[PDB]
mmCIF file of C-alpha atoms in Angstrom:
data_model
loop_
_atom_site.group_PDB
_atom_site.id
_atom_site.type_symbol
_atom_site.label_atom_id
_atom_site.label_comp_id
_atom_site.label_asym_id
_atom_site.label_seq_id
_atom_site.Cartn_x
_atom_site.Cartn_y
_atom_site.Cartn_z
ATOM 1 C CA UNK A 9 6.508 -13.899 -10.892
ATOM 2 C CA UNK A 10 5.437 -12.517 -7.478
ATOM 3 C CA UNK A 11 8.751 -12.223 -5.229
ATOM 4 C CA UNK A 12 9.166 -11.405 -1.556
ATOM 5 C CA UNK A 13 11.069 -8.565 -0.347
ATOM 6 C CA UNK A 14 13.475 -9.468 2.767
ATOM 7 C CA UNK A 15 15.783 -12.197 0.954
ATOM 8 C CA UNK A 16 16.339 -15.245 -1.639
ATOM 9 C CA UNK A 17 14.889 -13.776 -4.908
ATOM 10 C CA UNK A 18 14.559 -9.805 -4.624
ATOM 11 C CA UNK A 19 16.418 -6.438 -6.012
ATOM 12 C CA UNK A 20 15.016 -3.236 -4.573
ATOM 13 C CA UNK A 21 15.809 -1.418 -8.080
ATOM 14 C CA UNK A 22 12.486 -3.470 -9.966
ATOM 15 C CA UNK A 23 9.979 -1.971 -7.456
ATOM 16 C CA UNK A 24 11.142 1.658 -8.629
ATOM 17 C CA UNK A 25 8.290 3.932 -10.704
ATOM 18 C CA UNK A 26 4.591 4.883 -11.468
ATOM 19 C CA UNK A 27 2.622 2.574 -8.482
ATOM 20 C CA UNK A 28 -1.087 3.162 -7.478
ATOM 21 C CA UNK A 29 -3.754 2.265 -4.288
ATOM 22 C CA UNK A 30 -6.223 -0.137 -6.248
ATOM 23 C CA UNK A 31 -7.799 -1.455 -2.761
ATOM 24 C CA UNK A 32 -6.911 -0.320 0.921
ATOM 25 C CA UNK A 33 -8.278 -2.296 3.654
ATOM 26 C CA UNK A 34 -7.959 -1.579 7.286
ATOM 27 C CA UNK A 35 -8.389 -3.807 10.425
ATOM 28 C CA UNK A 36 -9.916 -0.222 12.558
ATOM 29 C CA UNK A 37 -12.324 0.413 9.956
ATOM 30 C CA UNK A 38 -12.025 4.462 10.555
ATOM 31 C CA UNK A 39 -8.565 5.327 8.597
ATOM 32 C CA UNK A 40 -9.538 4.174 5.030
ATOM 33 C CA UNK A 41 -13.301 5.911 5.153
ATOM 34 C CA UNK A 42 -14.578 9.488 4.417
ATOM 35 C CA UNK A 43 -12.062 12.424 6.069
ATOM 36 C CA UNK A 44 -9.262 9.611 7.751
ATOM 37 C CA UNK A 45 -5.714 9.105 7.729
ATOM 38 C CA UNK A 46 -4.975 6.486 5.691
ATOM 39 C CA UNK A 47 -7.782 6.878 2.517
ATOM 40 C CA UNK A 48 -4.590 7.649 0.715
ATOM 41 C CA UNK A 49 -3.827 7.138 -3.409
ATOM 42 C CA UNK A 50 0.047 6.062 -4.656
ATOM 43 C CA UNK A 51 1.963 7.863 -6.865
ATOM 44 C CA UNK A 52 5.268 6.471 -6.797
ATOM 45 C CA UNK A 53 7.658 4.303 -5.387
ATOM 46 C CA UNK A 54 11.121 6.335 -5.270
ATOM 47 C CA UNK A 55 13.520 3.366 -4.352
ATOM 48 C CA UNK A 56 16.746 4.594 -2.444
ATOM 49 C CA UNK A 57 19.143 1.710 -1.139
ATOM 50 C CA UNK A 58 18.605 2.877 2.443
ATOM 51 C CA UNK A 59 14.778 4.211 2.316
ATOM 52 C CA UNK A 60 12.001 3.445 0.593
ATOM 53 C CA UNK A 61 10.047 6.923 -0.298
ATOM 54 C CA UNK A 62 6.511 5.636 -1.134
ATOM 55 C CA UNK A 63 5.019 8.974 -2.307
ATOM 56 C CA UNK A 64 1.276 8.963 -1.069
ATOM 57 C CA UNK A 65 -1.381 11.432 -2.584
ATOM 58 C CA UNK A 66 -4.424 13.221 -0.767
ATOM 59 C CA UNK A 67 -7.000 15.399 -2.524
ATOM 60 C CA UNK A 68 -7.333 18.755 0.017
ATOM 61 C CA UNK A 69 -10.662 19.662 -1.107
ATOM 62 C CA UNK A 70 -10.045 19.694 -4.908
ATOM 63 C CA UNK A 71 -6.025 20.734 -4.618
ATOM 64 C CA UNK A 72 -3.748 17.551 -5.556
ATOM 65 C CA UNK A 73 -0.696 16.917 -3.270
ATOM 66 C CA UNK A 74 1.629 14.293 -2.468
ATOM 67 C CA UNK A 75 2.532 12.069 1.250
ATOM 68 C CA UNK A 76 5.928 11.656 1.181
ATOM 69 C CA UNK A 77 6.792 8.386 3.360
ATOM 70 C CA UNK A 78 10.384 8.036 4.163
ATOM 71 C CA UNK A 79 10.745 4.480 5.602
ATOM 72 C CA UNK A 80 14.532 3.809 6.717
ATOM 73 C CA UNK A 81 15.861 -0.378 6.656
ATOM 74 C CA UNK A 82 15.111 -1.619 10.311
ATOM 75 C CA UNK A 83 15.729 -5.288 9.485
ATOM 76 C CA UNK A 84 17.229 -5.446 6.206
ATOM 77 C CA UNK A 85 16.101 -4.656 2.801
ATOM 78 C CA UNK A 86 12.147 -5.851 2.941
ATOM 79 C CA UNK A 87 11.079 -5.088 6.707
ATOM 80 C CA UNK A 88 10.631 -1.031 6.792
ATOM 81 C CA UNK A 89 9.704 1.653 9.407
ATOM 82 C CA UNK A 90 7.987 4.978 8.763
ATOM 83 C CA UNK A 91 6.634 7.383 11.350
ATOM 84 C CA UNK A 92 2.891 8.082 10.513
ATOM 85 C CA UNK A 93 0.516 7.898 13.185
ATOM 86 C CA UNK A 94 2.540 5.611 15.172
ATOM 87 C CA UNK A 95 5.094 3.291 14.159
ATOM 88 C CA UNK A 96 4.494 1.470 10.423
ATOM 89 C CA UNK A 97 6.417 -1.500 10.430
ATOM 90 C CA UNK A 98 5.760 -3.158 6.768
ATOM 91 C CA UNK A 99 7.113 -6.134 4.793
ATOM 92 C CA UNK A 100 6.228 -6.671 0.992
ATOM 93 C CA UNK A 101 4.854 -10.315 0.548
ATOM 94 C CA UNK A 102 3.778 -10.830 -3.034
ATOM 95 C CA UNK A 103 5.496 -8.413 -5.088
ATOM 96 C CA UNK A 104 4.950 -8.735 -9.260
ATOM 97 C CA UNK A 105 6.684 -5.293 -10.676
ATOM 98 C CA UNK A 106 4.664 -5.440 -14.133
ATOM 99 C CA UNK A 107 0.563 -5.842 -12.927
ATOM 100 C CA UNK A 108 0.708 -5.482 -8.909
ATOM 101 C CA UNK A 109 2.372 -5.487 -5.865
ATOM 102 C CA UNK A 110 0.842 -6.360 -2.396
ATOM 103 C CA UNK A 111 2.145 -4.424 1.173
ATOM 104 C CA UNK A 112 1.570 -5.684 4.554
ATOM 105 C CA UNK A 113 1.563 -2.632 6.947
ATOM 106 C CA UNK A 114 1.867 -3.281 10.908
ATOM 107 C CA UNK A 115 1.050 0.304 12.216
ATOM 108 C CA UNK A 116 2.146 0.504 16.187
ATOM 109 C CA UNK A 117 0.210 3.015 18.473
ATOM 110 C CA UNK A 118 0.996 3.375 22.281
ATOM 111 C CA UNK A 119 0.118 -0.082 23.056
ATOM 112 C CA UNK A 120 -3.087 0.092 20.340
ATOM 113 C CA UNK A 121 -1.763 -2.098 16.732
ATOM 114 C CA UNK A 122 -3.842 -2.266 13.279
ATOM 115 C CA UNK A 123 -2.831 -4.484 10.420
ATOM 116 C CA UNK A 124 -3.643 -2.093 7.077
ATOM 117 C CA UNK A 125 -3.058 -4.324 3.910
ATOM 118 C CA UNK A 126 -2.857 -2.595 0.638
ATOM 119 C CA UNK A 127 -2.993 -4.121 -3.202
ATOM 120 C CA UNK A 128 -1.324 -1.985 -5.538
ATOM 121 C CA UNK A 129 -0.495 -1.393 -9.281
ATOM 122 C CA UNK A 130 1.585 -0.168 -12.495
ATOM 123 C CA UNK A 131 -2.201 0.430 -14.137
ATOM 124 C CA UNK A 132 -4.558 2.773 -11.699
ATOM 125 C CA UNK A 133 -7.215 -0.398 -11.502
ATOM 126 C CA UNK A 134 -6.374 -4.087 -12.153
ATOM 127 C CA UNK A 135 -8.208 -7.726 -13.187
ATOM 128 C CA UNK A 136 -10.675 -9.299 -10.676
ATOM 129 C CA UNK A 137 -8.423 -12.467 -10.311
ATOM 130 C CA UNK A 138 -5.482 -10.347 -8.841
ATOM 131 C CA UNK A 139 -7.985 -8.874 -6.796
ATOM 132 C CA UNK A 140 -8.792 -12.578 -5.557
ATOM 133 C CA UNK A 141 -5.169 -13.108 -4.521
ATOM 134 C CA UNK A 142 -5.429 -9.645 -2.063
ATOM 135 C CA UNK A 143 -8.765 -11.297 -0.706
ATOM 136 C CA UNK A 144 -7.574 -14.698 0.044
ATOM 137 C CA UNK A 145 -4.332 -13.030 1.702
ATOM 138 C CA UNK A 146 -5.872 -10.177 3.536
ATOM 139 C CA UNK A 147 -8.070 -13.223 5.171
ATOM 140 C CA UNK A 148 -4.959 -15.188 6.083
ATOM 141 C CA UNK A 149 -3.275 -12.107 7.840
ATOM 142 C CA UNK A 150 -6.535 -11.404 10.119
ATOM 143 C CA UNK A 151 -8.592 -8.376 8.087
ATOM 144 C CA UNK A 152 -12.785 -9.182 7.309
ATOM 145 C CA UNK A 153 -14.476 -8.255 4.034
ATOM 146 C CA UNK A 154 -16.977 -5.654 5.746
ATOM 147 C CA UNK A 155 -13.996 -3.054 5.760
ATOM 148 C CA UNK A 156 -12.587 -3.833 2.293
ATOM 149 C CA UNK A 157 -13.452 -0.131 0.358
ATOM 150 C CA UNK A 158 -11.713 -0.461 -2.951
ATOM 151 C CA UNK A 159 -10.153 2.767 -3.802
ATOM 152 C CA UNK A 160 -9.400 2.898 -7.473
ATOM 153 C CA UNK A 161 -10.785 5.893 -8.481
ATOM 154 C CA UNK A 162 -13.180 7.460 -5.445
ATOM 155 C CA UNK A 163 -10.947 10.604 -4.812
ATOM 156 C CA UNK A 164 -8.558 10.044 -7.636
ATOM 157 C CA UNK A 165 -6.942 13.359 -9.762
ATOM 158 C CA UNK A 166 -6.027 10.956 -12.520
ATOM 159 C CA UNK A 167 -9.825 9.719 -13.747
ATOM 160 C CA UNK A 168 -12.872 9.360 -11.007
ATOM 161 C CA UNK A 169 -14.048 6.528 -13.350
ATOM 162 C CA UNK A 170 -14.114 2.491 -13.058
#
């Protein structure tokens, strides 16, 4: 049961708790890598009916801290904005809220867009045939399988281990 966020078949409320980056693929190629912006780990989603505060994690050399991400309702419950290195526009396409959930970020620079498309997860690392489904819709959207780093446990406080 994989719904999709802006209308027919959705509550915000079953999207709310423990959430975790399992793969994060960029378009750039530069913001997922080694010392970038967006090589960042989920901890949870805190659901507010208003803003959804997806709580981020970065390791600052061996100190564990957490990204808060306040993204307001531009176009109804579904299509978000958030302020982080631009202007992240995101809509939640295939959303399960028991194994996984897949986010399709649009993140607007000065004239300069990237498409970043994350699968995530109630476990920290999931089955190879969810992992399938992210691949075949990370294709349709426009994003190539040389930049798909999956980051399940390569700077991870939880367990560094696969």
């Amino acid at each position: 049961e994989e719904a999709s966020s802006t209308g027919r078949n959705f509550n915000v409320e079953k999207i709310n708790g423990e959430w975790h980056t399992i793969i994060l693929a960029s378009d750039k190629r530069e913001k997922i890598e080694d010392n970038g912006n967006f090589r960042l780990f989920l901890e949870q989603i805190h659901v507010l009916e208003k803003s959804l505060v997806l709580k981020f994690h970065t390791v600052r050399d061996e100190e564990c801290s957490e990204l808060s991400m306040v993204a307001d309702k531009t176009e109804k419950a579904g299509e978000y904005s958030v302020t982080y290195d631009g202007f992240n526009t995101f809509t939640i396409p295939k959303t399960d809220y028991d194994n996984f959930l897949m986010a399709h970020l649009i993140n607007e620079k000065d004239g300069e867009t990237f498409q970043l498309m994350g699968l995530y997860g109630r476990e920290p690392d999931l089955s190879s045939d969810i992992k399938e489904r992210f691949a075949q819709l990370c294709e349709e959207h426009g994003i190539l399988r040389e930049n798909i780093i999956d980051l399940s446990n390569a700077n991870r406080c939880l367990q560094a281990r696969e």
